[PDB]
């Protein structure tokens, strides 16, 4: 996965055209030691992207890597340490510290439902309510954190919502419709009630959500469904009930809440002397 | 003024690809349907400009009015935006413009909230920098619309000197002295993080001092010391249960990183009839 | 998606109003209105007006116009492509970069249908190359095709186009096709050759498409029989407009020509005022 | 003058995000031997750029300086030459080859005019008319070729346009505000008659541009300025005329043409 865009594009927005002009007016040759410190327990996301832009500032800044996405670690651990022309790394601290902050803070809580429906056979994914920009960022940190993902965007799956049935008038036809046009996509569909989910067995889908049912609703759709198609729960799922949704036999969880809605990590840059 | 066209454009090519939306075009032909843009809960309206901006790429296939725009404080089930269009044209482009207005409207109503809750003083709630990456502009907006305002757009518009400028020229004193060499007549703002450092800051007659995570005893002796020669703000990520005790010190600004990352973004929806 | 114009928009607006603004304009002008119409000076294919739709709508309720002609319309001296009423103020600052774009994009336009136009009753279609203006890739490109053009690939991700220097540096055409196929399967394969012996080596490893890169009628006529049509053949180079019929009536399928998006006249586009 | 924002703009359009497939589908530890070499008598203008690109890709490229911005050079001259991973080099050589033909055919152009104009004190001056987002390329190479520029943009300098004065109603009252405005801004107005250049000699302004006035008409406005403002012509400038214009005693001709509807320069990429 490329990060090269948006590195560039949260450079721009932060050191425009005239660049850092307090650093600038400030300091020359002065070398400094830092380290890249969590100041809470987390799970590790977004140093490949810290790397690339050390990387483009190769001649003025050493590094080294002591922790890579994924990895569980603990309040006070250091990341990344090094030295470099303070003049090169103050102006972009808080564009690395801000994406690390936002990647872990994904993985994070991705993490913690993992954790959560541990030894049931389900897998937590991601949906397409990411940060505008950072679809896949987004994504990438909540696989990380031990999550999946059905598709990228609007062209890499088959997913008939809501608003398709409610525009075409029926399931029915809009399978119809796509089945025809499109060579043998495998297809997924949203469904509401149960009368859908029966609608959608009849035409034979390979993956069913249930979007905001209750747990008996959820059970019901798994005893009609009888393992003829993938099984998916969607929506914001809270941590204190994933695990009921995971015990009732589907086989996907996925979570708005992962990728907006989440809790950035603290995280910071410490410069000795 | 602030443009939106760019970000946009990134959210648009991010979700449709070279590709298009494969499930939409293989299903819709010529369906037109009613649409509204619902709140699910109370907020401060924001983003709404961008709605426009992507509805206004289709004018020949969206038609709508917008009922409520940014800053407009609304209730649960109402409508924001309704209207008609060509199914194909708007189903696209559902997702991109929820993910924004859901976004923009989640900063600014955390914002309001924390402007009503120190209403009664002087203090205004600022922006920080520590937006969400590549929606700066975006979250400082949103931040504004919410009641709040912001110190600078980025580190070429404003000098704000920090622990990591103190730390790597080895004094207050010198980096003031070395900026104003470099910058005259520019306006000077530092952050502290100790009572030390707010005395050093005010013998060189800065314009303005962040207390930066400073305990309320450590704020209200700041207050007392500076004795209004310089502009004071507070700068952490504050609950909301304690940022009116804060205001209530006599500090002039407090700027809060949790209002442009770690909100909850609010719910908002696009209803089709039908 | 269509294409987005966006980016290169807020570079020119950027470029020429940087921080500080219009100064000439911010410190004459406070409320005038004025009516304004944008008007040819000679003939020419207009190209450009998506840009100029974009800047204006960016100033919504200060400039008010109506669009008069649109993309690919042939136009002649004095024609009012656009016109309206505007606050002075919001129109002035946005002048030069609305000018420079629809110039350019018209120039452009305007050169690829005389290229077009003379090779009329051929089957040949004029190319686009890669020798655009730097950062104008895509509106180079997309005005080539308002005048009557085409395009093989967009840059450098898009298609198979084996060049001279990759024959240098691998050595041999045999072998640059032999590796290109074991990484890259079923993909259409085109390949320059500046002579007669590199057609035949291309020919004989079954290329879809054979450019012919600065060779003479002769060598073109040659090659054209040695093909016999089991290859589609281009001929790239800056032809002539007085000789780019002679290369049509040869049998190629293609002339790609760099100096329809370099070293091309803009068009004389200005703002005349009331 | 930075040029990272233009380069990375141009590798962005041209590489995106797969990358040069052809390149990347044929060559791996290929290393060879090239130089950039004109085809065309020129200005040599943009080796900045070329160094900025390469020094990208310090460990897979090296290279020699064997001309730089300014320099006058033959057909058939080897302007750089080295050796590359071909890997890292032939997906840049487009984009190198496109700002240095581009940058050499704006300094090449410029030079023909100040050459003509030699011997009297006329500077060759750039103007707004440039390429879109290479404002700053385009007024460099101007700058190369012998020229000069009053303003990058319309931040660092005031200019009183045809439209200012349409706008507003006259240049009395359009330099009034201005001087209240703003402090003690040098003031450059264009004038497209006599009448025109006599009122903004009345408001003491520092220069007055003639646009598209004949011979005759600014030879009659150097007479009435007597050395009392700058003058500049603007207008129809061909390398035909610009030294009739240049002997009327004017101290500037400010040229679009040199920055837009020029010939770029034929300089190619040769490997061995």
Redesign the interface.
């Known amino acids: 996965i490329?990060f090269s865009?948006?590195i560039?594009?949260?450079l721009?927005?932060?050191?425009?055209?005239?660049?850092?002009?307090?650093?600038?007016?400030?300091?020359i040759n002065?070398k400094?030691n830092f380290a890249i410190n969590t100041r809470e327990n987390l799970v590790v996301c977004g140093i490949p992207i810290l790397e690339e832009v050390f990387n483009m500032n190769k001649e003025h800044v050493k590094y080294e890597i002591h922790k890579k996405d994924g990895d569980i670690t603990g309040k006070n651990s250091t990341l990344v340490s090094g030295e470099a022309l303070?003049i090169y790394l103050?102006?972009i601290?808080?564009?690395i510290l801000?994406?690390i902050?936002?990647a872990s803070?994904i993985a994070s809580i991705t993490r913690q439902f993992v954790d959560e429906v541990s030894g049931t056979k389900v897998k937590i994914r991601s949906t397409?309510?990411?940060?505008?920009?950072?679809?896949?960022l987004d994504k990438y940190s909540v696989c990380i954190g031990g999550g999946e993902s059905y598709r990228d965007?609007?062209?890499?799956?088959?997913?008939?919502?809501?608003?398709?049935i409610?525009?075409?008038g029926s399931i029915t036809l809009?399978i119809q419709?796509?089945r025809k046009?499109?060579k043998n996509?495998y297809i997924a569909i949203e469904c509401d009630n149960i009368s859908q989910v029966e609608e959608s067995l009849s035409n034979n889908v390979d993956m069913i959500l249930l979007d905001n049912m209750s747990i008996s609703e959820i059970k019901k759709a798994v005893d009609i469904v009888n393992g003829k198609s993938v099984l998916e729960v969607s929506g914001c799922v809270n941590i204190r009930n994933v695990r009921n949704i995971a015990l009732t036999g589907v086989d996907y969880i996925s979570i708005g809440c992962i990728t907006?809605?989440?809790?950035?990590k603290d995280i910071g840059?410490d410069?000795?002397?």
């Open positions: 490329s865009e948006i560039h594009n949260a721009k927005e932060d050191l425009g055209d005239k660049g850092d002009i307090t650093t600038n007016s400030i300091l002065e400094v303070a103050l102006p601290e808080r564009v801000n994406f902050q936002h803070g397409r309510k990411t940060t505008p920009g950072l679809r896949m965007n609007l062209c890499d799956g088959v997913l008939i919502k809501d608003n398709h409610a525009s075409c809009a419709r796509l046009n499109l996509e907006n809605s989440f809790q950035n840059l410069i000795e002397y």
